[PDB]
Amino acid sequence: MSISISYSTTYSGWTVADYLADWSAYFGDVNHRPGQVVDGSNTGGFNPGPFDGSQYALKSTASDAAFIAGGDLHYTLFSNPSHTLWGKLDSIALGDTLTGGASSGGYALDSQEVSFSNLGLDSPIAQGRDGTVHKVVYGLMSGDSSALQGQIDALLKAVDPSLSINSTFDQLAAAGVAHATPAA
């Protein structure tokens, strides 16, 4: 099953690349880095956890932005290769106001902007932080969505070579890849 995109009508005339660059600058950087994860304020969380989930979600420390990564995800914590997020990444949902978590049966967003599904990414543990899943998710944590952009671009081009990260959301909808959020 090919990449599928949901978008708010707000972004109909935006390119995916422009949207993601703006979103990354808006979410910012939670400074989740060695020596800087010293309490619970910039960890994110897994469903179900503690270190593995069908979801990993993180709130911005700068804005009301959040993302939810869906798949079959694993974090090595202190085990070699340390601080590696790996496994299957099927979806990324971007928006405002993270809700829920493991204790309530899943994470959600009150105000999703855009989501990307059927990403088909799967990175093995032995690649460590060179894994694509790691780079995609860590990029979203740290204010740089270039890894995500690159993966979306490749998926779109494989559907049809006229599609790209520089297609508008409405162009992707005309191609059958994207769907605007229902009206009313």
Side-chain angles (χ1 to χ4, degrees), residues 57-152:
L58 178 66
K59 294 176 186 186
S60 175
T61 56
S63 64
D64 187 43
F67 72 87
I68 305 170
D72 184 14
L73 293 164
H74 314 290
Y75 189 61
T76 62
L77 192 67
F78 312 128
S79 304
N80 282 5
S82 63
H83 303 298
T84 294
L85 190 68
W86 64 282
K88 293 178 171 59
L89 180 65
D90 303 312
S91 65
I92 291 290
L94 306 177
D96 289 338
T97 321
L98 187 64
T99 66
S103 72
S104 59
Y107 288 106
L109 297 168
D110 271 349
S111 303
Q112 180 181 107
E113 291 174 1
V114 176
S115 72
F116 308 90
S117 302
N118 306 315
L119 294 173
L121 292 166
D122 189 5
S123 296
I125 193 170
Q127 279 188 290
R129 304 174 198 150
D130 294 324
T132 299
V133 167
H134 184 90
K135 288 181 163 187
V136 166
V137 176
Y138 188 67
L140 296 174
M141 299 169 67
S142 64
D144 182 355
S145 61
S146 67
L148 179 61
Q149 289 176 51
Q151 296 305 311
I152 293 163

